Amino acid sequence: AIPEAPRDXQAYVRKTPEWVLLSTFL
Amino acid sequence: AIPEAPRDXQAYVRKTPEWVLLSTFL
């Protein structure tokens, strides 16, 4: 099942099996 | 287990253990 995102104070989006940083888009 | 986002029709990103509105980044 998908896990919690990193406990790192960064926003993530979902892409295939990954949490990916929103800052890679914006 | 990761819980659902608010049932409000808006886009949320995952930031640590919180759903945060995408619009706050825009």
Added chain:
Amino acid sequence: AIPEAPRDXQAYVRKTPEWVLLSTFL
């Protein structure tokens, strides 16, 4: 539980209880 996003190499965010493409909000 929140399921996996569509496995297609595109970024998704949560909109209520569904995964919706990030691009649709930008």
